[PDB]
């Protein structure tokens, strides 16, 4: 999940 | 009444129309923003949604700004796309 997207 | 649906600049407490977006395989907020506002996965059960009902009315609890870091992702957006995830509960 953290591979796919992150908070920015 | 104060019960009118927000369409932009979503704030805690806003009434929002949460709709199934088939092209992005997710629930989103109805908006006139060009940016996608996805429903946060944690909010699905309390809205009686499943990971489908076409729309539900919710109350905004939290907003988070995100970016896709891989080209293949659950939001069906390209690498680098920025979008929001919104936590919401039922309006009723």
Author numbering:
A (entry chain B): 102 to 109
B (entry chain A): 1492 to 1542, 1551 to 1591
Could you share sentences copied from the article?
Recent findings revealed that TNIP1 functions as a checkpoint mechanism that fine-tunes the rate of mitophagy by disrupting the recycling of the ULK complex during autophagosome formation. The phosphorylation of the TNIP1 FIR motif enhances its binding affinity for FIP200, enabling TNIP1 to compete with other autophagy receptors, such as CCPG1 or Optineurin. Here, we determined several crystal structures of the FIP200 claw domain in complex with phosphorylated TNIP1 FIR peptides and elucidated the specific recognition of different phosphorylated TNIP1 by FIP200 claw domain. Each FIP200 claw domain within the dimer features a five-stranded antiparallel β-sheet and a short α-helix.
TBK1 phosphorylates both S122 and S123 in the TNIP1 FIR motif, which is crucial for affecting the binding affinity for FIP200 (18). Phosphorylation on either S122 or S123 enhanced the binding affinity between the FIP200 claw domain and TNIP1 peptides. The binding affinity of FIP200 claw domain to the TNIP1_pS122pS123 peptide did not increase as expected, when compared with the TNIP1_pS123 peptide. For FIP200–TNIP1_pS122pS123 complex, due to the electrostatic repulsion between the phosphorylated S122 and S123 residues, the side chain of K1569 did not form additional direct hydrogen bonds with the phosphate group of TNIP1 pS123. Consequently, the expected enhancement of the binding affinity between the FIP200 claw domain and the TNIP1_pS122pS123 peptide did not occur as anticipated. In addition, unlike pattern II, the cumulative phosphorylation of the TNIP1 FIR motif does not enhance its binding affinity to FIP200 claw domain. This may because excessive phosphorylation in TNIP FIR leads to electrostatic repulsion and structural instability, as shown in FIP200–TNIP1_pS122pS123 complex.
